[PDB]
Each structure stands twice: as C-alpha cells, then as structure tokens.
Automatic annotation (TrEMBL):
The chain holds residues 35 to 182 of 435 of the full protein. Residues 21-144 form the TPM domain. This is Conserved domain protein. It comes from the Bacteria. Coiled coil: none annotated.
Length: 157
C-alpha cells in the first residue's frame, strides 16, 4: 500500500501522447497495455480525443473525483474543461475507478454515462478480481460510444 497523489503519477500526456496508458498499481501487463495503447491511440486519431488511463496502488484518504480532476488539469487534458479529453484513474486500495471529461466530450460522454460504464463492465470484473478485464472493457465501452457516434475522423477546433 503506497499512497499516490496527482504529482506522484508520471505525466504521460507531457511526453507519451501516443501511449496514454499509465500502470503504477502493477495490475496491467505489457500485452494488456499495448492492446490498450492501440485503442487509446485509435481514439487519439479517429475522434482526436485525448483519453488517458492510469492505475494506482493506493491514494489513501484522497478524494477520488477531485483526484482525477487535479491530475487531468496539470496534464492539460482536463485543464479547466479541455475540449476532446478524458482521464481514467483506477485505485487498487479502493477497488474503484473514476472518469474525468473536459467540455468537448459533453456531447458524447456525460459523467453519468461514464459512471454507469463502471457498473456495467468494471464492477462485475472487480468482483471476480479481474482488474485488467474491468479496465480494458471500461475503456472499450467508452471507445465504442464514440466509435458508434463519430462515423468519420472528427476534429473540434
């Protein structure tokens, strides 16, 4: 159990803009991460959306929803409601995940929808102990929402 804060997470969206995946919890693996990289990168191109996935061992007593916002803002992807940007953070000691949308995804992915996706895919796996399966299908769920709506490479500004 190691406590993590926003500036304890490696700022991948400061350099790794083609990966977007961040495993600190040690729950994912190179294969799972690389397959997820292709998914996030596909969205990063097709829908132009900055979708970053992060996993942490523990946040301790830190507020999960506020945590995601703080991390997204410093990375830019959520800096006072960024257009096509979305953050995802998993916390092992809490067994919970939380999404963070800026403003450009409000016409696609509402917070409530993202909250439901947690119950639809993440929870059933976390109950079985499948953290990797929960994350992967949680990401795929968000992906398919966009993939089904934006039939063509769509750029906002």
């Amino acid at each position: 159990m190691r406590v993590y804060k926003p500036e304890d997470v490696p700022n991948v969206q400061l350099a790794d803009s083609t990966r977007l995946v961040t495993d600190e919890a040690g729950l994912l693996s190179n294969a799972q991460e690389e397959v997820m990289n292709g998914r996030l990168r596909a969205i990063r191109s097709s829908h132009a959306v900055e979708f970053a996935v992060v996993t942490l061992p523990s946040i301790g007593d830190a507020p999960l929803e506020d945590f995601t916002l703080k991390l997204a803002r410093q990375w830019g992807v959520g800096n006072e409601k960024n257009n096509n940007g979305l953050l995802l953070v998993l916390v092992l000691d809490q067994r919970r995940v939380r999404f963070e949308t800026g403003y450009g995804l409000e016409g696609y992915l509402p917070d409530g929808l993202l909250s439901r996706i947690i119950h639809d895919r993440m929870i059933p796996h976390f109950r079985s102990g499948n953290y990797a399966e929960g994350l992967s299908e949680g990401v795929l769920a968000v992906q398919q929402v966009l993939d089904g709506s934006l039939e063509h490479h769509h750029h906002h500004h």
